[PDB]
Every structure is written in structure tokens, then in C-alpha cells.
From a paper:
KV1.3 was the first ion channel discovered in immune cells three decades ago2 and exhibited only C-type inactivation. In summary, we report the cryo-EM structures of human lymphocyte KV1.3 channel and a rapidly inactivating mutant H451N. In these two structures, the VSD is in a depolarized conformation and the inner gate is open.
We determined the cryo-EM structure of the H451N-mutant hKV1.3–KVβ2.1 complex and obtained an overall resolution of 3.3 Å. The external part of the mutant’s filter is dilated. Moreover, the carbonyl groups of G446 and Y447 rotate and cause their carbonyl oxygen atoms to deviate from the central axis of the pore. The deviated carbonyl oxygen atoms contribute to the breakdown of K+ coordination at sites 1 and 2. There is no density at site 2, while the density at site 1 is stronger than that at sites 3 and 4. Based on the cryo-EM structures and the MD simulation results, we propose that H451N-mutant hKV1.3 inactivates rapidly because the pore-stabilizing hydrogen bond network is weakened, leading to external pore dilation.
Author numbering:
A (entry chain C), D (entry chain A), E (entry chain G), F (entry chain E): 36 to 361
B (entry chain D), C (entry chain B): 106 to 210
The structure:
């Protein structure tokens, strides 16, 4: 329906698709494909761009900050996020302490060459640091000007409620968003838990990896194609999930959904992206592409969403069968 | 959790309210419309001294009293509003002495 | 709205006080001289336990009780000070049992 | 009566007339007329100068910041305001979010070449952004030094009371002023609503467009004069309000008030400006002029105010007949 | 007794004498006498130096900031104060608003060439500005780093209690000191009012003009000596207070106190300075001198204080007779 | 057990040994031994480095800041502390006032050439300054960015509870640590008092001088060796504690503990360091060395700790006999 929607109940207006960053930027794909990938995504209305400080050991940000410096886009028209967690080998360089949030955002604001990011994310929950230190540290970088909002990522629905009860007590700022994984085979958290937080306290949801790193892309039925994600080093954990019997059963479940894709005049990635956007409790979907012909067919999946009637939803549920108990 | 009965702050644990998971305060979808996300509390605009005996019902584990100041037509509405159930409504009955009428054969 | 009766915080909705748009608390030009723009509340320096039955008069929709501790010469002044009207003053009458004298023919 | 009065109940002392800025500055009139218009207004005791960031697409501020840089006036003797709302084509460049208030005031503090404005105004209410985000954002730019006070504009009397109940709760700063339209044909809001807020919470009133963009100026009886406001492009909405039967009925009501102007030794703009200043609930009136001979006759309308007796007020009410129900 | 005492109940340690600044610095005396006056006062243990922004129309600070720049004293060993009130002809340049405290301290931190003063004083109470604006403005300049403490001057004992009840409510900083006039003929406020505030809330007292601008100095019995304070322009109000019958009655009361001065091996200024220091409710006395031979005899009045027994106090009370009703 | 542990309940992860700084750095040992002493301690996993501003009259920091500038270590991998108390001869240059914490940390951030220290310590309690001023001053330097945490040193267990009841009232930051002396002959405070604060409010313990300045090092049985600590000037108070009968009785108690050292394949300093680390209520031990062969045998005392069984603890208690009454 709406293209530009609010991030939860905050004032940030994000595009419903957002170009992410992983192994592609600074790693797998080159630097000229990266500048090509951003200019044909920014021109199609997408303003939300993600990164972190663990991607490519701090090289995914230098290839992202060089594009915006060269292309000359206004900073007021973009939304740049950044996650903080593992960015060092030392002991005092990974965590959600006050020393790492203030230093990690300051060092990742020179690789991006900016002056502030829009949202700064806590990449995973820290059990050693108390919750009062992480809420006080994220409010300090907002008030110094280094960010505008903050949000959690991979936190449970109890630790988001715990980092809100602290912020409403010490007069600090609560989080505005949450990054939770969401596709057709991991739909537990964003369907039964996060829609209750959106009505209670008003956090959003910014789902990541909607194609399960290319598993739902349908390229993994006959084996491993060359120059794919699983054919790179460090991704044996991905390849052992599709070579196993559990992944091939999902590949057996992808054959019937292939038939529902061609019925609606689309392909299977264009269904799986627009399947995530069928709700109102999801505020944006973080995409990912390796070349230009992958991306422009993914942005085209907005028009698939008005074709997504209640009948096609109700029988996709029959093929998957992993509807969570509500 | 913090409950704000028209200005009086009652503050109890969550596992105390989860002892009775069918009432108003026990069901996280029925009490969710009384939330107040600016102060992180639940705000009911009800009678003040009648809630001191509603909260003790959860804490003690089932007993129902009646405070001396609140009359019977007032306290019979708070049990009806907080949806304590007929088990708790009939436990309020013989505490006041009035036994219900027996079913005729 | 927040009402601060000499230290005790009573906090009710605005549409509850607008049910009786002729009293002290219902008229936005009569209660405006009791405002406190530093704490965003109305401050009355009156008797503390007598306001628990004044606020219940607005919430229930017309009933008048009398709390047990406050005597009759005290509670008859708070109805005179909050300007509840003779309709509410005569409803306080037969609640205490004392019926007014009938007009002679 | 008093020339320099307080802005509501704050500590800011403003002149009761203030030179505004619209289509004139940077648009209609030239740049040499603009520097002439400010030096003969600053010398007559007026210190309050208004602008915004939507006027002339961000060119009304460059012609205002160049005058104060050239003329060499002390910054401590002026009061410069600025409104924030529409200043971009993008989606994340218009609103009252935290991202636009902090960026929009920072970009409009380089076109003005200053270091801080005195009041920063919210130009119209935003329904998407919650009230806690706009009060927290306006308190952030005050504490960083970029402003001194803040106020609302075109907000209702409920959303000013809502942006005060938040500020007194989270220990933030409430607004000090409100810009509401006020002339003889729009006198509803500033007469029955804003005098109740001045006694309750202490906001002021800074009325804008007192001549209704030249309608009360009496130049629009025989038609459209050349080089007028209605004769410019983008002002068909003004011209269709005076060519309609509703505006000509106001022109029929301006013929009798023309007779009351010459009785008191003044013209009809000098009556209409001093008619607004007859209260104490109005703290300043924002003027507007196109040339020097328009302005010096408007500043002269201070002395008309001690001639404004209760008899002339009571029969001006009879000619207009739009006295609001109190 | 003790030389370096606390300023009230704060942590600032001030010398019990402090060299002030008025008509002498930048006005009456030259610039070479001024540098001579500071180096022979700083070497005798005095660290507290006063100024303001109305003295010599902003020239008493340029002659004070040039000495510390030239002499090379460490900033951590001094205590420099500054008062804010009248420092401009305009309307928005005098007051205790938020616009004048932030601008007036910033402009008076370039004439002093420092980065922060120690105490910033409110020179007289403002009736137009509300108390919440002046406490919020003085807390803003402390948190920005431009000052360290703040205090009032010429405020009554009710407006110091009102600027404390606000600061303990909105979580701001209360004042730490108060400048009240104190000599043998004005001893009302510092004896019956300010010792109650020192026990209740903990403010100090920093008395000014202990010789009543040279009246108690004994030079004004036979008339006006040349090159005195009364012989300068703008001081007719002083001269009409000593030529009047009221001042000559004080001169009649100075003849007997002249006899008590020579009994204790001192002169009459050395008695009047040490008469003020006889309490514990007074934390410092702000001196004033015109040449070197005036000053070194005034700093010597510390040793007069252990000679001040209860008998000499009890009969000085008999000569003056203005003991306030306790 | 664990090498890198949390500092109390905060998020700071410190090594259980930390190289301190006293008479050695900048004083006794040279500058080339100092750079040698840090590089062979940083390479063994120790990141916690201590200093203060009274050591060598402000020269222990210039020799510490020059090493990190030259060696090129990342600031995010270190933990640098600093204590504030006596750093001047003047009266307003020693204390825990707001004027000395803000100035003393700013001047000690140029001798270290850093931009922020990790913990800033209050070196001893100040009785003149109230507790509300010291908690407000330490929260001001944290929020300005000049530090990350703060802690107390030599404060009693009541003044740490008093500087926590203030911080939880005015919405400030409480301390996270406490430096208390701890060895075999001073074990009162860290064993019966500070383990109660770790469970109540969550402060840590960072013990200093574990060898009692070389007394437990066993070099002081036959007299004073040359080039020792007691053989330097200004350390007569140390030499009179080992020449007295009380210290020789401790030397009589060191002869039996010499026998327990060789039984476990270690020397007596390697026992005394690992004796302190036997608890969980102690978060780090601040070492001290004069040359390289002293230090590398002290870092080796980690492996002595798993040999420290309950039997060797229970009979070391029999030799000392100073077990505090629990
Ligand atoms: N908060 C966290 O903890 C966290 C963690 C990880 C990632 N993330 C975010 O998640 C975002 C999404 O990353 P993702 O790569 O996992 O999302 P994804 O959409 O599930 O992965 C897409 C991958 O599949 C391929 N692909 C996309 N469309 C295709 C199409 N039509 N046909 C064939 N192949 C197609 C692409 O190249 P290939 O064919 O070469 O595979 C791409 O690499 C990342 O950018 C990151 O910002 C967040
Ligand atoms: N907060 C908001 O949302 C908002 C929105 C809009 C404007 N404003 C403020 O309102 C302020 C006032 O603007 P305005 O122009 O609408 O006020 P105005 O006084 O009603 O308009 C005056 C116009 O009429 C003409 N005029 C003035 N005096 C005249 C006289 N004696 N004889 C003949 N013509 C005369 C002038 O030139 P012409 O003859 O060529 O017309 C001028 O353009 C603006 O500066 C702006 O700061 C605020
Ligand atoms: N907070 C406020 O509102 C406020 C207002 C005004 C002043 N103040 C402060 O008050 C401070 C004190 O100023 P003040 O001049 O009025 O104090 P003062 O001590 O009463 O005046 C001393 C004057 O008398 C003369 N004098 C001093 N000792 C003398 C001696 N042994 N023999 C002969 N003459 C002697 C000096 O030169 P002469 O002989 O030439 O007179 C000097 O000018 C000022 O520095 C200012 O900081 C504060
Ligand atoms: N917060 C406070 O108030 C405060 C006050 C003072 C100190 N401190 C901290 O305490 C820290 C520890 O200082 P410290 O010197 O007193 O600790 P220490 O470990 O008790 O003293 C060790 C001294 O003994 C010697 N030594 C060490 N190991 C030895 C070994 N195996 N064999 C022979 N000699 C050995 C060393 O050289 P020598 O043989 O030449 O003696 C060294 O000088 C300081 O760095 C400082 O940061 C804090």
C-alpha cells in the first residue's frame, strides 16, 4: 500500500524496501558494482541504507561512505543505520558497555565520513553489561549529536521491555525499532511477539534477510551454482543447511510455490519479498543483491503486493504449514 | 507492574497478577487498553479504596474481603468490572453472610 | 487532570469533570485561579479525606456518600465550597436521614 | 501604550511591530529595496525580524543574513525568528521529526550566517510525529545553543496544551509563543482561545498578516492594480478570494471603515494595524511591506492607538459584525 | 581567624579579603597602577577578584584580562567573578532573560580573554523575567562550561528562597552566594536575614563596599579632598550624602571611633574592615583601593581581628547605636 | 580462574593484574626502562594502567602519555585511570570541589595527550565539599566526554553509600569502583566491608600495593638493600616501619611463609599476589615493578592461583592470625 511509512511510531519516514549490506559490499562484489547498485536504488525511492562495523572487518563502511561523498547526495534525504557489537580482537572492544558504544560509534563515523547516523543499533544482547549502562550510553550519543534514534537487534521481547522500563524511569530515550529475522521459514518472532510491542510501547520492526541468504531465491535446487553465496569461503554453515535433508525439504516446498509465482506474473523472489510486506507490523524489509539485474527485479515486487489477496495468503500457509500458534 | 487507580499508585509483581490468568489484570490483551506509555503504568479511573481489597485478593491467593467504608453496591461493581469471575463473586457472597438460594427439586 | 488536595494527588480524566458543567471543578473559569503552572496541577488547601467522596460523586455520576471519619459540619462545607449545587446538597440530606421540613399550606 | 512588551510571560522583550518576510524578501522586491527596508525599520525601534525556510525556496534567508552581515548590527540587539516545516522535496525533509528539526535548523543557520536564532517556530502541526518527539527535539536545539526559545504556529489550543503537559512531565522546556492569524475578518482564535492560554500557562501571541495580504489596504475596490500581490504568479488563491462575492462584500464593508479612518486623521491601514494592538493578549504584530513609502506610514500607526477609544471600537464591531461568541 | 574559608557551604575556598573593581580599574586610576595593584595583592594571599560588565562601559574587564595574560598566573589559582545586568542601551540587552545571560557572559568572556569565570552573579533582581527562566539560564552556562557556580546580588531573602525552591524542583543548580552591602551604617540585611539562610539552605555572603566608598575612611571631615571619589564626575549622589546633615552626623560618630582606632594601634579603615570580618556568616569582604599605600594598610587589617575582643565590639555598638532588632 | 573480569557490575572488562605507577615511573626508574616495562606488560594481556596527578609532581603522566603516543597502541584496547586530589600548592588547587575536578582532569588530559580517561578516581575523601557537589562534578566530566566512569579511593563504606543515595536522587551517575589497600597485613576493609557493597549496590574493588611496597617481597630481612624503595629520599616513613619491632615481627612471620612458597614451586611475591586474587570480590590488583625481571615473575602468579587450595589458605591464616571478625 503506502511506500513511505513511519518506523514504528517514531517520526522517521523510511521506504518499505531498504538496501542492506553484507558480504556483497566491500567483499564479494567490487567497488564499481557497488556505486552502480546504490544509484539505481536511490533513484527508485529507496533511502534506507544499512551497514555495521563487523562487515568486511570495517571495510563495508569505507565503500559506503565513498559513494555518498562522490555522488553528492544531500545528507538530509538519506537514512543511514549502523550496528555496534563486534569490532575488535581485544576484550574491551566488543560489548555493549559505555566504553564501546561511545568509541565504536566515533570510529565508525570516520569510515563513513559523516557527522551522524540516523539509527544506531545494538547488534545482539549483552549479558554482562547491565541494562542501565546501555540505555545511558545510547542516550549519550544521541544528545552529543552522533545519532538521532537507536534500536535493538536480535533482542528478545523481554529485554526490549526491560530497556523501556529503565528509560521511562531515569528520563532517558527508549528505542524506536527492532531488527528481527523474517522469512517463510522463520516467522515466529515477528508474528506473535513484535505485534504486541507495537501496540504496547510503539517499537517497529525492520526485518532482515528476507530470502534467507538466497535459499528462497530458487537457485539452490540442483546444487550449488558457481559464484553464489554458498560458494564463498566462511559460508560452510550456509551450505550445510541446504545440503542437509532439512533444507532439501524446504527445496521440496519451494517447488509448489514456484507454481504460485508464475500464476501471478512474477518470480519466486518477487513473491517472497512482497509476502513479508503484507502486514502493517513490519515497517521495512532490508534487501540484498549481488548485481544490477538482481536488484531491479526485487524493487519491482511492490506491485505484487496489491495482487496478494487473502486466497493466495491462505494457501501459501497450507504449503509451508509453519503458521505460529496464536 | 504499576497500577494507578485514579491517583493512588499500587505496584506489584507480574507473577502475582499471573496467578489468575482469566481476569482483567491477568490477561495481557484485556488490560492492554488501559496502558499509559508515557509513564509506564496502567491507569484506571475507578474508586480509590476499593482496589486495596482487589490487590489483596491476588496477593493472598484467593481471599476476598470488603473494606469498611465502601458500601455493598459499590464493591459488587468492582468485582464485576475487574472480571474476577463467579467463583470470586460467590466467595464474596457468604463472606457477607448472604447465602444464595438453593435450586428447587 | 491532576488535583492536589494539600498533598494527596487525585488524578482523573477531563470528561469526568465535564459531566457537571456548573460546579467549581467543571467550570474552566472558576477553577482557573487554583492552577499551578510549575507542576501542571490544581492545588486546593482543603481537608484531605473529604475529597475522596467528592471525586466519587463525579465518577459514579451523582451519588453522594460521606466518609466515616469526617463529621457532618466539615463535609457540609466541602459541598458548599466545591459548589455542587442544592441538587447535590439535598441528595446529601436524606442520605443522612434528615428529611427537610415541608412547606406549610 | 507600551512599545517594548514581553513575549507572553517570557523574558524576551519585543517591539510591538515586527517586520516580517514573505514574497517581498528575495522574491518580489529586489535586494537594494530590502536593505533599505530594514535600515529604516531598525532605526524606528523595531527589532523583531521574521523568516522561515520555505520562503523563496531558501532565498529569503540569504538576503536577510547578508544585510546584518553588511550593516554591522550587534546580534544582541536583534530578535530573529525562523519556522521549520517544508524545506525539501524528499519524504524525510518535511515534518516535525527529530531528524528534520535538528537538520533544518542547522542548514538554516548557514543561510542566515548566524550562530543562533532567538525563537524557532513549528510552522504547522504534524499528525504523524508524536508530541514527545517534537518537544524533545526542540529542547535539544535549545540546549545545544542553536536557539533560545521555541514556539508553535497554526497549532490548535489543544496541541499547545498537549505540548505543555509533556514538557512539564519529562522536565523539558515548554513553548513561549504562538503565531495565529488575526485581522478584522479572522478574529476567532486570538480573541476567545489564546487569552485563556495566556492566563493558564503563559504563552503569548504573535499575529501574522494583519492586512490580510493587502485586502484591508483598500487598494482592491476597483480591481487588481498592477505590480500588486495578486498580480504575481502563484497567488491565484488570493485573487479568487477578492474577485468572489465574499471578498467584494468585505470590500463593501471597507467603504464605511474608510470614513472612520479619515475622521481620526489616518488612513485605513493605519487603523487596521492599530486595531490589532488594542489588546494586551497580543504581544506583537508582524508587518509586511513592498517599498519604503508603504512601511513608514505603517510604523506611524502607534499614535493611532491612544486615539482608539471605546466608542470607535464599539461601532467598528457594528460594521464588521463578526464578533465571536464569548 | 581562618584566612581561606569556604564560600558558604560550597567547595570554593576564597580569601577573606578580595580585591574588587569599580571606578578605580579602567576609569580613575591608570593602567600601570592597576597592574601594580594586583601583583601586590595576589602576593599577599588574595585570590578573589571581582568585576562586572557595567563598570567603565566594559573597560574594567579589558584592563583585568590584560594583567593575567601578561603576568602569567595559573588560572587554577585564581577566583574571578562577574556580574550580569546592564550592558547595553537596547531593550533586549539588559535583564535576566535567557537571551542576555547567555550572550552577556559570552561577550564578557572575550574582554577577560578567559574560558570561564568562577562565579557569575545576577546583579539585581528582574521583576519581568520569571524565576524559572533565570535558574534555567544560569544552569545552562554552568553546564556548557562557561562558569562554575552562580550567585545572586541585591536580591531579597525571599527571592533567594524562591530561586532555590525552583532549582530543587526541576533538578537544576541552586545559587551558592549572595552579595549584600555591609558596613557600620548598613548592617540590617547581613545580620538578621542572611544568617538564617546560611543555616537553612547554605548560601554565603560576600559583602561589598565596606568603607561606604570612603566615608568611613575618615578623609571626609573637613570637606572634599582633591582627587577623591566624590571629586569625580557622576558621583554627585555620593557628595550629597556627606554634605547633608545625615552624613555629617555620621562624621560626628566617626570622631569617637577615631579614638578607639589609635587605642588598638591601628587606623580607622583597619578597624572598619576587621569589624566586618568578626562574624562567621560573612565569607569574604570585597575591598577597593586607589593606590598602593591605600591597599597594603588594608590587607594588614587581618591582625586587628584577634584584637577585636567582646568589649570593643560591645561599645562600638554604643557609639553607632544602629544594632538591628533581633 | 577468569583472566578478564568485570569491574564490579559495570561493563568495563579489566585484566586481573594491572600495572600501576608510583615512584617508579618518572622518578626512580629511567624513561627507557619505563617503555620496556609497558611493552612486556601489554603483550601479556594486561590493559589496565594507573596513574594520578600527584605522582612525580605531574611527571608520571608525561612519561606514560609518551609511550602510548610512540608505541602506537589503539586507545580502544587500553584502560587508563587517573586520580584527582593534590595537584597544586595554592588553596583552590586541592580538593574535591567542582572547580578542581573540572580543571584537574582537563590539565591532566594534556600531560597524557589523550582525549578521555576511562575511570577518574577521587583520591581521598574531602570533608569540606558537600557530597552533592562532588557527584554533580563527576557526572559533568563524564557527560562532557572527558571520562567514562568514576570511582572512589580511600573512602569509607558510609561515604560510598552516601555518594550513591545522592546519585539515585538527582538522576546522576553512581561510582563503579573503589580502591582499597589489601595485603596480608591490611585485610580488614576488603574482606568484611566491601563484599557487602558488591551485593548491595554493585561497586567493585581495585586493590593497591599488594606487596606493601616491597615488605612482603622478602628482601627486607637482613636490612636495607641498596637501590631499594626504602633507600630513596622521602621514604623514611617506610623505613621506620620495617626497622621497628612491629615490622620485624612481620619479618618473623615471613620466614614461615617462605617455606610455603617453595613447596608450591613459586617464590613469596608470587604467593602474595595470587593470595589477593583468591576472591571474587576483588576485581583487579594493581602491581608495581622497578625492572623487567621483577615484573615477568609477577605476571606469572596467575598459575599459582589454581594451586591455591583450601588447605594452603587455612594454614596461611594460622601463620598471620589477622583474620577479621566476621
Ligand atoms: N542485525 C543483524 O544481526 C544482521 C545480521 C546479518 C545481516 N543483517 C542485515 O540483513 C541484510 C540482508 O542481507 P541478506 O543478504 O541476508 O538478505 P537476502 O535477501 O536474504 O540475501 C539475498 C542474496 O541472495 C541473492 N539474491 C537476491 N535476489 C536474488 C534473485 N532474484 N535471484 C537470485 N539471487 C538473488 C543475492 O546474491 P547471491 O545470488 O550471490 O546470493 C544476495 O546475496 C544485510 O544487508 C544486513 O544489513 C543484519
Ligand atoms: N507562521 C505562518 O504560518 C505564516 C504564514 C505566512 C506568513 N507568515 C508571516 O506573516 C507575515 C506577514 O506577511 P503579510 O504580507 O501576509 O502581511 P500583510 O500586512 O497582511 O500584507 C501586506 C501587503 O500589503 C501591502 N501593503 C502593506 N501596507 C500597505 C499599504 N498602506 N498600502 C498598500 N499596500 C500595502 C504590501 O505590498 P503590496 O501592495 O504589493 O501587497 C504587502 O505586501 C510574513 O512576513 C510572515 O513572516 C507566517
Ligand atoms: N554587586 C553590586 O551590585 C555592586 C555594586 C557596586 C560595587 N560592588 C563591588 O563593591 C566593591 C567595593 O567597591 P568600593 O569602592 O565601594 O569599596 P570601599 O572600600 O567602600 O571604597 C574604598 C574607596 O575609598 C578609598 N580608600 C580605601 N582605603 C582607604 C584608606 N585607608 N584611606 C583613604 N581612602 C581609602 C579608596 O580610594 P579613594 O580615597 O579615592 O576613594 C577607594 O576608592 C567593588 O569593587 C565592586 O566589585 C558591587
Ligand atoms: N589510590 C591511592 O590512594 C594510591 C596510593 C598509592 C598508590 N596507589 C597505587 O598503588 C599502586 C601499587 O604501587 P606499590 O609500589 O605500592 O605496589 P607494591 O607491589 O606493593 O610495591 C612493589 C615494589 O616492590 C618491588 N618489587 C615488586 N616485586 C618484587 C619482587 N619479586 N622482588 C623484589 N622486589 C619487588 C618493586 O621494586 P623495589 O624492590 O625497588 O621496591 C616495587 O617498587 C601504585 O602504582 C599506585 O597506582 C594508589
Amino acid at each position: 500500500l503506502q511506500f513511505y511509512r513511519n518506523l514504528g511510531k517514531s517520526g522517521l519516514r523510511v521506504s518499505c524496501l531498504g538496501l542492506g549490506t553484507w558480504v556483497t559490499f566491500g567483499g564479494q562484489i567490487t567497488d564499481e558494482m557497488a556505486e552502480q547498485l546504490m544509484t539505481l536504488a536511490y533513484d527508485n525511492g529507496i533511502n534506507l541504507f544499512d551497514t555495521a562495523e563487523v562487515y568486511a572487518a570495517g571495510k563495508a563502511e569505507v565503500v559506503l561512505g565513498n559513494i555518498i561523498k562522490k555522488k553528492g547526495w544531500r545528507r538530509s534525504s538519506l537514512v543511514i543505520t549502523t550496528k555496534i557489537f563486534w569490532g575488535g580482537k581485544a576484550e574491551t572492544e566488543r560489548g555493549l558497555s559505555r566504553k564501546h558504544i561511545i568509541e565504536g560509534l566515533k570510529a565508525s563515523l570516520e569510515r563513513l565520513q559523516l557527522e551522524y547516523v540516523d539509527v544506531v543499533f545494538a547488534n545482539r544482547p549483552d549479558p554482562n553489561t547491565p541494562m542501565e549502562e546501555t540505555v545511558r550510553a545510547m542516550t549519550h550519543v544521541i544528545n552529543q549529536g552522533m545519532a538521532m534514534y537507536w534500536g535493538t537487534s536480535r533482542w528478545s521481547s523481554m529485554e526490549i521491555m526491560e530497556a523501556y522500563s529503565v528509560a521511562r524511569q531515569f528520563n532517558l530515550t527508549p528505542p524506536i525499532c527492532e531488527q528481527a529475522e523474517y522469512h517463510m521459514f522463520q516467522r515466529e518472532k515477528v508474528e506473535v511477539q513484535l505485534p504486541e510491542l507495537f501496540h504496547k510501547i510503539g517499537v517497529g520492526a525492520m526485518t532482515w534477510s528476507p530470502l534467507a541468504c538466497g535459499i528462497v531465491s530458487g537457485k539452490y535446487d540442483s546444487g550449488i551454482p558457481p559464484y553464489s553465496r554458498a560458494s564463498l569461503k566462511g559460508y560452510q554453515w550456509l551450505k550445510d543447511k541446504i545440503l542437509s535433508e532439512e533444507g532439501r525439504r524446504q527445496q521440496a516446498k519451494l517447488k509448489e510455490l514456484q507454481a504460485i509465482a508464475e500464476r501471478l506474473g512474477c518470480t519466486l523472489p518477487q513473491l517472497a519479498i512482497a509476502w513479508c510486506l503484507r502486514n502493517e507490523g513490519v515497517s521495512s524489509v532490508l534487501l540484498g543483491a549481488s548485481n544490477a539485474d538482481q536488484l531491479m527485479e526485487n524493487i519491482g515486487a511492490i506491485q505484487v503486493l496489491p495482487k496478494l489477496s487473502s486466497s493466495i495468503i491462505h494457501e501459501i500457509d497450507s504449503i509451508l504449514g509453519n503458521k505460529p500458534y496464536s | 507492574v504499576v497500577i494507578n487507580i485514579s491517583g493512588l499508585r499500587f505496584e506489584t509483581q507480574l507473577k502475582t497478577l499471573c496467578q489468575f490468568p482469566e481476569t482483567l489484570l491477568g490477561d495481557p490483551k484485556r488490560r492492554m487498553r488501559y496502558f499509559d506509555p508515557l509513564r509506564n503504568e496502567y491507569f484506571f479511573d475507578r474508586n480509590r479504596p476499593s482496589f486495596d481489597a482487589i490487590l489483596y485478593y491476588y496477593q493472598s491467593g484467593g481471599r476476598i474481603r470488603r473494606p469498611v467504608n465502601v458500601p455493598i453496591d459499590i464493591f459488587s461493581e468492582e468485582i464485576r468490572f475487574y472480571q474476577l469471575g463467579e467463583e470470586a463473586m460467590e466467595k464474596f457472597r457468604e463472606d457477607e453472610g448472604f447465602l444464595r438460594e438453593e435450586e428447587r427439586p
